[PDB]
Swiss-Prot record, chains B, C:
Organism annotation: Lactiplantibacillus plantarum (strain ATCC BAA-793 / NCIMB 8826 / WCFS1) (Lactobacillus plantarum)
Keyword Magnesium: no
Location within or outside the cell: Cytoplasm
Cellular component terms per the entry's GO annotation: cytosol
InterPro entries, A to Z: aa-tRNA-synth_II/BPL/LPL (IPR045864), Gly-tRNA-synth_heterodimer (IPR006194), Gly-tRNA_ligase_asu (IPR002310)
The protein's name: Glycine--tRNA ligase alpha subunit
PROSITE patterns xref list: AA_TRNA_LIGASE_II_GLYAB
GO terms, biological process: glycyl-tRNA aminoacylation
Subunit structure: Tetramer of two alpha and two beta subunits.
Family the entry assigns: Belongs to the class-II aminoacyl-tRNA synthetase family.
Lineage: Bacteria, Bacillati, Bacillota, Bacilli, Lactobacillales
Pfam families (alphabetical): tRNA-synt_2e
Name of the gene this protein is made from: glyQ
Catalytic activities: tRNA(Gly) + glycine + ATP = glycyl-tRNA(Gly) + AMP + diphosphate
Curated annotation (Swiss-Prot), chain D:
Complex and partners: Tetramer of two alpha and two beta subunits.
NCBIfam families: glyS (TIGR00211)
GO function terms (MF aspect): arginine-tRNA ligase activity; ATP binding; glycine-tRNA ligase activity
E.C. number(s) listed in UniProt: 6.1.1.14
InterPro entries: DALR_anticod-bd (IPR008909), Gly-tRNA-synth_bsu (IPR015944), Gly-tRNA-synth_heterodimer (IPR006194)
Name of the protein: Glycine--tRNA ligase beta subunit
Keyword flag Protein biosynthesis: yes
Pfam families documented for this protein: DALR_1 (PF05746), tRNA_synt_2f (PF02092)
Family assignment from sequence similarity: Belongs to the class-II aminoacyl-tRNA synthetase family.
Organism: Lactiplantibacillus plantarum (strain ATCC BAA-793 / NCIMB 8826 / WCFS1)
Length: 635, 299, 299, 694
């Protein structure tokens, strides 16, 4: 029979940002159980409140053995074998769980399916809302949600979140406010209450003197309030949250929350008007005490190193005089705001406050934009700098960080990345893709060491011996980026195992090869190139005299392939798009195949064999721009 | 209008209610600390298999929180009310709600959040999982199941509730400053603690003797290790508390970089782990008297 | 037959009565001492013209009285109940009688005597006159008007009542050993503090480091003098209490001859006298808030 | 009318040792007021309770003595004419005194009748003088202890709680700083309550209602009566001390005597320890039997009724049994260690900084005691036992019994040494070297203990003056005056030749011989001891009624021997009548006064007979020579006195014939030699110039 079974675990209150996936895992386990226990069903609905996870199996067939005993055996393990970021030791037991287990509801339409865990057996009695509600019996598996609605709990997470959203729209439309809701913020809120009632509070207009970033940080990040703006996007002195109650004494709770937020806001105003006191040179000099790390040294000398790096990057990258001067100034002062109490209370707001303070002191706003952006990206899916100066600044910052932190041997591990250096490298790669620059990660060792010897040699013993492994760490991050975009492993191992080790070359070659891989004329080309590289790898020539002599040629395919190679080198240049490069190289595949058909390179005359190997190694060197194409498997 | 509870009354009501739940009313441990978790009635008594149900007030001196008496929520010393019950009863949240009800707080009239905070104290190796109880947007409590205290697997599990007396009183008495508190018999918290705030602030910031602090820490560590060596747990633990407060004084003075901070915490971690080891060893050396007599009391 | 009152209930009854008598429920100061006199709520608060009404329990660690858990009334650590009222009300003996009657003790069924004892603590320069209150021949209270605290004339007069909680509990519970004392919810005092008593006894007698005590005292005195120089009353007073406890441990170790005992007392006495100087100077430098509040409370 | 006043100051509870002297001082202050405020009354009864001091003035004459002045004027012949009328002068003298001629009375003066005008200048009535005297009486009192109230710093025995000031039923209103005086008294803190008083006589009666016995005599009578009732009821022989009764009487207001028992095992410990614990610390009356053997029972008194008596008894039993278990442990642990342990540990106990340790004190006292046995003539066995005791006499100080009971020093040393297989006489000597216990107290019954005590206290005083720790007129921090007093008492009770003149050399001499670590300025510092000890002997002599002049005569002897002074003083306080004695005293006073102003070298007194002018010089010289042929430190004092004095006819014939003040230097020097030899011989007994002849 297509009966309906009901399983609710009632717990202590759980962290919001993980409540939903846990019940999703439970759905998964229940479904997997039913497949593994060879059961049929129509649906599995889930219910989540901060105190309970519930599954409802609709249309459950009644035999695999009968349903009751299969559930008895399986449900205990279903509950136990669920997985969490954290698990906890309860009263006398080493049994670890996300939160200790308080009650269990296991009902087969009207039947009590006993499945017993610790001190709490399984019964048909559920607990209602923790403040407004009481415990309640459960009659039928279908009635569950309705019955909970009596005890003033919204079990359906989707319906509860919708309810909060509807109240949000009601408040936005009643006071002509523009409430802007965040989705992880709403996710937290939805999984923090069981019977919601949205509310709004006000705060004093004098605090509107301050930048919106501090206010939104306070509200959203700490009090989890939704800042109120107008149509013109001006920030209004109001905030919104949701109470875990009804509309009883809503005014008093709102007043208490206003009091708390106003405490935080007064702290912020004090920090603002206290940080305003000092001039920029004072912060710069005080930065000498701030060590960037134990074994590295201070943040001020780090800023000097980044300043030199930024000057070189402006030179190499081609920026106008104004851009170069602004970049130099920013690299001079971009990290000063790190020594402030404003960031001491708001760790999230670091960097941006430097932009606001320096711009406030009558400086150039582009410098402030770079200061705001040298933290960007803020996450793995975060935003990238909108200005050249900020991108260059962040790249230089992370370059210094990774070089030094590998000079200290702190290479991040599989689960431990103490300094987000993996994220820093990932951000560098993402920015490079967005901007497209020629980037030798091959010779940066010599560049960094060389230039520190030139200017400041205190940071100079084993600092490029540890910078060679960094090039492969950046490479691993690029490979993981490609595997995030599903690219074939052989394309990966080809663009990765390149001699150039240039980021833009890797990206462009991978894009071109992901495009042309569906053409019929592709496989033959690949075979020819692979064959060529296989023959060229063991040549005993100095790769500086590869001049090909047409007089040592036996047939004409050698002569004209040599002419084609020459005219390709006369066109193949460093200022060429990847698609043109590949098309031109591939176009010669009939030439290479008829070359090998006609010209046998395994020659009983040494000098001619050397000449032919030169003619082949020139193309091999041109190929190695794209990488090690022998690492493409075509089938 | 109804009367808000003085600090006095808050302490009395909490103590009486938890006594109604079989907790023991110990007194604050006589050493300078930064939280009541480090008092032996919480720390040492929560390990081993011996049951222990206590509740006691504790002055916590946090030098880094000294504000020269202008900031009315950050103080050189604030006071916590520690509830520590082992093994944890399944109604611990119910009893916590009942305690808030006895404090003149109607849950029907207010919004309370259990926002998870995996509590950690690295110096003593204390680990715990639990919530920060937020009241009307204001954090008022620390409610935690202990999991690893002094590096040791905790059996039975000890529940802890930390009431923040300064913020709790400021909310309940509806004052905007902690020094505007009706402490007891109508006397303001400022009227007593205004001088200690300024004096200890200058002590921790601009007046302490640095080489003195260094020698004090080193000698305390030497002596605590020697005392553990013979097997004198409590005096060595007192010296460990002295080491911890010494580290707090130096770190607030501006002597400890991030480097040497970790080393100090490692040394304190080793001290606390060894102290816990020896204490459990000696309680096993005594047949665990608390187990025998508490089981005798149940029947 | 009636249930005897546990230490828990005794302390609660005393605190309730004194709260009803306008006393404030302060906490025991978090430092090692030898009597409740050395808490600033007793010591520092008795000088100057500011009124003060407090009541608190206080652990008294007297190293020479430790007995390794054989003698069940003289211990390394006992609990005193300090009641300190300034100025002393003329009905103070009436309040003391009401309190002892609140403990369920009818004077009609018992013998109570006020035996003159010239109370003195020379190291702290504290002088007082009053009785040792004997119940059925056993001293249970120390009731004293202060005359010269820290060498200074006491204006107004301060009354203090020091209850020996261990002896009182042993009497009311009619037990011949403190290790059978019910602290709270039936948990035995022995099962808790039997290990601390033995451990502290062995530390104070047969394991403490002599040169450590000497150097610690001398450095503590240097630091207290430094704080007096700048005017940090409470930190210097804490260092003075630690000095006195170190001296007590030295006497228990067998390190202080009778000769230098007087010299150490002289150094500690000057320490306390200078602290009193700085404290009164700063409190009169702040316009005496408690006088303002007494004017407010009379009106 | 003769009135009755009632003044009770009711206080907080007072220490017994001042309750009676306080009420006696209140009597004295009231009497000083009444006389200076010229008041007469019938009686003043006193009442004292641990909480109040009360005087009751019966028959108070309602006025300060009015000035009934009697002023004399002119004679009757001048005040009255022949016609008997008043002369105008008899009008003027009466008018000036504020009277008329009617108030004139004629009173005879040496056979002349003078007028007298008794001007009744009235004095003062009770109320106002009472106000003034109450104030001044309150201000002055002095006490061992001191007091302080809130804003009223003032030193007193105890805080003042209530004041009753009643004039037969009339209220004397007077307020003290905040505390008024009213007719309300307070009963027992436990059984009673406040109560009003109608009349000043009713006071005692009303306290009886609220069950407080103000009459100290009645309280003691009832207490002793109930004690005797229990003694005759349980066949006990209670031995009560009287000072304990003083404490108990001045500690209670409504008595109920009671007895408790304790365990027979405690009879294993010495009876001295049991009596000390109970009596001195718990204030119990030990019980003896008919044969006077001590029973394991005790008696005390509650300040209460006979309700729930056994519960109080059990509380006292708990306290006593706790102390007794402590005593048993101390006893049975002190027995475990051997004597050598205590002896060696005595090295650590410093007797003082500049003196040294108590072990070194035992060494010095050991040498001193051996030397004293030598000089005093003691047997071989006595000397050996004394040496052993001085070896070990101070060991008991490092016993647990002395740690708990400081009084039982010496006694425990005897107990343990007898237990430790030592000589019981040695232990008794250890017990006796502490004696005497006061100025009025017991002395050692044995020669060994006497010598030990003398040597110990001699070392103590010699060392304490060797370090400059000289007590002042009212301050004696070490009770050394009592030690010297005991020295005198023991020497007198034993009667030994003890010259403080040469003891300096003896002590130094023998320390040089044996242990020179105590040998630098220790006879230069015993010279002021030669200047000491005299005042203590003088103080005892003035305690024994002896004429100050007899004291100052026997004291100023050259020998400075204590027993020599004792016997000479006995002789001279015995002769208050001999006829040829007064002439001797007069002649000797003249001779000594004349010799005091001789400026010759007192080492060169060889007398040259060729410088003689008459023959009485030769006869006196011959008498001097044949007396010197006997005169030695080897004759009893009366022999010296009689031999010197009997030749007074020779002395008088010398002074009559030979004029001593000679204008020839060598002749006067010869006379001064012949006289200063006699002066030196006389000064053995001392300075007879301190004799008043009557």
């Amino acid at each position: 029979m297509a009966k309906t079974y009901l399983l609710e675990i009632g717990l202590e209150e759980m962290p919001a940002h993980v409540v939903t996936p846990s019940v999703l895992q439970l759905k998964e386990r229940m479904i997997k159980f039913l497949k593994d226990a060879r059961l049929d069903f129509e649906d599995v609905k889930t219910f989540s409140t901060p105190r309970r996870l519930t599954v409802q199996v609709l249309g459950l067939a009644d035999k695999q053995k009968t349903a009751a005993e299969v559930l008895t055996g399986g449900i205990k393990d279903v509950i136990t074998k669920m997985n969490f970021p954290t698990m906890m030791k309860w009263s006398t037991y080493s049994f670890k769980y996300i939160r200790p287990i308080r009650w269990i509801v296991s009902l087969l339409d009207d039947e009590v399916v006993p499945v017993q865990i610790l001190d709490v057996a399984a019964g048909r009695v559920s607990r209602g809302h923790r403040f407004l509600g009481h415990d309640v019996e459960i009659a039928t598996a279908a009635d569950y949600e309705a019955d909970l609605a009596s005890v003033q709990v919204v079990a359906d997470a989707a319906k509860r979140k919708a309810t909060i959203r509807e109240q949000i729209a009601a408040l936005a439309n009643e006071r002509d406010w523009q409430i802007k809701v965040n989705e992880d913020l709403l996710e937290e809120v939805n999984n923090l209450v069981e019977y919601p009632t949205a509310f709004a509070g006000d705060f004093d207009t004098k605090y509107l003197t301050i930048p919106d970033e501090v206010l939104i940080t306070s509200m959203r990040d700490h009090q989890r309030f939704f800042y109120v703006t107008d149509a013109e996007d001006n920030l209004l002195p109001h905030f919104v949250s949701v109470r875990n109650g009804n509309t009883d004494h809503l005014e008093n709770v709102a007043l208490g929350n206003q009091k708390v937020l106003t405490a935080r806001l007064e702290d912020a105003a004090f920090f603002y008007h206290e940080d305003q006191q000092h001039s920029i040179q004072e912060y710069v000099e005080r930065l000498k005490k701030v060590s960037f790390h134990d074994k590295i040294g201070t943040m001020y000398e780090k800023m000097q190193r980044v300043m030199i790096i930024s000057d070189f990057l402006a030179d190499r990258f081609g920026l106008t005089e104004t851009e170069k001067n602004q970049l130099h100034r920013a690299a001079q002062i971009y990290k000063f705001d790190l020594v402030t109490g404003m960031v001491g209370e708001f760790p999230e707001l670091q960097g941006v406050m430097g932009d606001k303070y320096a711009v406030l002191k009558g400086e150039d706003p582009a410098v402030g934009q770079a200061i705001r952006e040298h933290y960007m990206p803020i996450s793995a899916d975060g935003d990238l700098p909108k200005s050249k100066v900020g991108a260059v600044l962040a790249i230089a910052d992370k370059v210094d960080s990774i070089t030094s932190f590998f000079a200290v041997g702190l290479t991040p591990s599989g689960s431990n990345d103490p300094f987000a250096l993996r994220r820093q490298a990932f951000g560098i790669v993402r920015i490079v893709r967005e901007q497209g620059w020629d980037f030798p990660i091959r010779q940066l060792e010599a560049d960094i060491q060389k230039e520190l010897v030139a200017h400041d040699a205190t940071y100079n013993l084993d600092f490029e011996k540890q910078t060679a492994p960094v090039a492969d760490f950046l490479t691993d991050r690029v490979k993981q980026w490609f595997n995030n975009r599903k690219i074939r492993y052989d394309i990966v191992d080809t663009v990765i195992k390149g001699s150039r080790q240039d980021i833009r070359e890797m990206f462009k070659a991978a894009d071109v090869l992901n495009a042309h891989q569906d053409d019929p004329q592709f496989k033959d080309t690949i075979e020819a190139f692979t064959r060529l590289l296989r023959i060229t790898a063991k040549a005993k020539l100095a790769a500086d005299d590869l001049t090909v002599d047409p007089s040592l040629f036996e047939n004409e395919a050698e002569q004209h392939l040599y002419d084609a190679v020459l005219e390709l080198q006369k066109q193949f240049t460093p200022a060429m798009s990847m698609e043109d490069r590949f098309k031109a190289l591939a176009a010669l595949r009939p030439l290479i195949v008829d070359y090998f058909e006609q010209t046998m390179v395994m020659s009983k005359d040494e000098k001619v064999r050397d000449n032919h190997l030169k003619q082949l190694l020139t193309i091999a060197q041109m190929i190695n721009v794209m990488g090690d194409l022998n690492q493409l498997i075509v089938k | 209008m109804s009367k808000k509870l003085s600090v006095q009354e808050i302490i009395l009501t909490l103590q009486k209610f938890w006594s109604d739940q079989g907790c023991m009313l110990m007194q604050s441990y006589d050493t300078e600390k930064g939280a009541g978790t480090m008092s032996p009635y919480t720390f040492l008594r929560a390990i081993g298999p011996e049951p222990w149900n206590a509740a006691y007030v504790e002055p916590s001196r946090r030098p880094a929180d000294g504000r020269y008496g202008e900031n009315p929520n950050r103080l050189y010393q604030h006071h916590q009310f520690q509830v520590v019950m082992k093994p944890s009863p399944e109604n611990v949240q119910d009893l916590y709600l009942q305690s808030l009800e006895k404090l003149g707080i109607n849950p029907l009239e207010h919004d309370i959040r259990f926002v998870e905070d995996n509590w950690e104290n690295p110096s003593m190796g204390c680990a715990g999982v639990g919530w920060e109880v937020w009241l009307d947007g204001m954090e008022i409590s620390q409610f935690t199941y202990f999991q690893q205290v002094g590096g040791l697997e905790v059996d039975p599990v000890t529940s802890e509730i930390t009431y923040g007396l300064e913020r709790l009183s400021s909310y309940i008495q509806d004052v905007n400053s902690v020094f505007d508190l009706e402490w007891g018999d109508g006397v303001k918290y400022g009227d007593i603690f205004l001088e200690p705030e300024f004096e200890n602030s200058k002590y921790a910031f601009e007046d302490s003797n640095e080489e003195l602090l260094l020698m004090l820490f080193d000698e305390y560590e030497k002596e605590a290790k020697r005392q553990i060596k013979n097997g004198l747990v409590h005096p060595a633990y007192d010296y460990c508390l002295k080491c911890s407060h010494t580290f707090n004084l130096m770190d607030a003075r501006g002597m400890v970089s991030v480097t040497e901070r970790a080393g100090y915490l490692d040394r304190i971690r080793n001290m606390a782990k060894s102290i816990a080891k020896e204490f459990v060893a000696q309680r096993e050396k005594r047949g665990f008297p608390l187990l025998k007599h508490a089981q005798e009391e149940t029947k």
